[PDB]
Amino acid sequence: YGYYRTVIFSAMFGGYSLYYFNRKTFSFVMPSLVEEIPLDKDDLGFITSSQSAAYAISKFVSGVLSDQMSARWLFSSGLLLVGLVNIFFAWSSTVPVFAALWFLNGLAQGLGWPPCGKVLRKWFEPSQFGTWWAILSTSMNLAGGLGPILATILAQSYSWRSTLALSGALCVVVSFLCLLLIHNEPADVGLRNLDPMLKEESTLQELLLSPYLWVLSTGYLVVFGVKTCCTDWGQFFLIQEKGQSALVGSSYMSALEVGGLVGSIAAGYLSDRAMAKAGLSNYGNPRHGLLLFMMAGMTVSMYLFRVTVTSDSPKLWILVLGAVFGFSSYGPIALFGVIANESAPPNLCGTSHAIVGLMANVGGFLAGLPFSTIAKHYSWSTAFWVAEVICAASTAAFFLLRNIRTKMGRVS
């Protein structure tokens, strides 16, 4: 029994990191690409947005029909397609072609997320799902940190083409391995399935009218959209306007991801500690106080980065701002998942998470072409100023709505 749970969870952890590294490989190798194939700021945006659009369509549709699909096949198939797209991209040299391959990568990526959830419920008792989900989430943060550094070093003699085209062969091999290892159900290998686990079931039309659902959703679009702006365009702001080199720009990229690793873990640990001292009720959520502090740090940290950082600034001051931003950015994302689960009606628990995910990727879309267009017209600094203002305004609005009703659905 135990031997099987370790092999599976490790395997899913391994697979998830590779989907992500491959989703972002484009951002990792962007400075080099621009130098070899010269491109305008706007062109870069179109390629980034195209992936975000596909992912959103795929992730919403997939979840709805996932109850009809097998996890072992779905995870493996998705990985193979992502890998093949990466190989082709390196060979290709023109922008219209690059964008279409990126859309295809986005759609394949969608296939991966629903299976992970199904195995987790099936092999682990419902009580522990929360802990496992968070450990699994850390896979992304590890991959994201390792990659930028690897690129700024591997590009010493190798081409951008050959450093993206191994991230395809490795994907194919690991897809085969994960097809071999993952098992859909405990009954498949001979072990007994886990023991299976009618009070005012709200109708779907009553869910969409809940005031707290939108405050929790639009508050997730702003945080996620801002995190994508600094993840993709933060490197060119230092390279072009701040007079920094490419190595320093990629060093800031890794320190951003490392900060979130200690941020997601601390957010879960700190949240329930405060929850046990007050308790839960219909009006308000005790984790609001912790969420406001993390959001406050995010807007303050970005303000110092735009103004204080310059060519004279030492390397240490650049990294510390990135690390603090990573802690303050990834922290709300972990809390938003927990808050949605408890507030959601028991009968519509699954649909509530899907709705939040839909508006999640819309924020990523706005961080692509619309953000790049503002930067090209005036400057990179002008575009980042707009992102700072939007984040600050959201915190004040969410502050005033801290005492609204949270339990979605008709409450007697």
Ligand X SMILES: O=C(/C=C/c1ccc(O)c(O)c1)O[C@@H]1C[C@](O)(C(=O)O)C[C@@H](O)[C@H]1O
List of residues contacting ligand X (CB under 6 A): 113, 129-130, 133, 337-338, 340-341, 353, 356-357, 360
Instruction: Report the distance separating Cα 38 and Cα 13, nearest Å.
Output: 37
Tell me the closest approach of the beta carbon of residue 81 to ligand X, in angstroms.
19
Instruction: Report the distance separating Cα 190 and Cα 240, nearest Å.
Output: 60
Dihedral of the alpha carbons of 216, 222, 228, 230, in degrees to the nearest 10: -130
Nearer to ligand X, 60 or 88 (CB): 60
Nearer to ligand X, 45 or 345 (CB): 345
Nearer to ligand X, 10 or 128 (CB): 128
Residue 345 is encoded by which pair of tokens?
A: 């009606």
Nearer to ligand X, 139 or 244 (CB): 139
Tell me the closest approach of the beta carbon of residue 52 to ligand X, in angstroms.
14
Tell me the closest approach of the beta carbon of residue 204 to ligand X, in angstroms.
17
Q: Vertex 377, ends 376 and 383: CA angle to 5°?
A: 70
Tell me the closest approach of the beta carbon of residue 352 to ligand X, in angstroms.
8
Nearer to ligand X, 200 or 272 (CB): 272
Q: For helices 2-36 and 129-154, what crossing angle results, to 10°? A: 30
Q: Any long-range contacts for 27-30 (C-beta under 8 Å, 24+ apart)?
A: 27/231, 27/232, 27/235, 28/147, 28/148, 28/150, 28/151, 28/253, 29/151, 29/155, 29/160, 29/163, 29/164, 30/232, 30/235
b/e map 321-335, b = 16+ CB within 10 Å: bbbbbbbbbbbbbbb
Nearer to ligand X, 130 or 243 (CB): 130
Distances (CA, A) of 408 to 47, 94, 215, 394: 38, 49, 12, 21
| Backbone discontinuities in the chain, residue before each (C to N > 2.5 A) | 197
Tell me the closest approach of the beta carbon of residue 315 to ligand X, in angstroms.
32
Nearer to ligand X, 88 or 129 (CB): 129
Residue closest to ligand X (Cβ)? 130
Instruction: Report the distance separating Cα 99 and Cα 270, nearest Å.
Output: 42
Instruction: Report the distance separating Cα 151 and Cα 200, nearest Å.
Output: 55
Nearer to ligand X, 216 or 230 (CB): 216
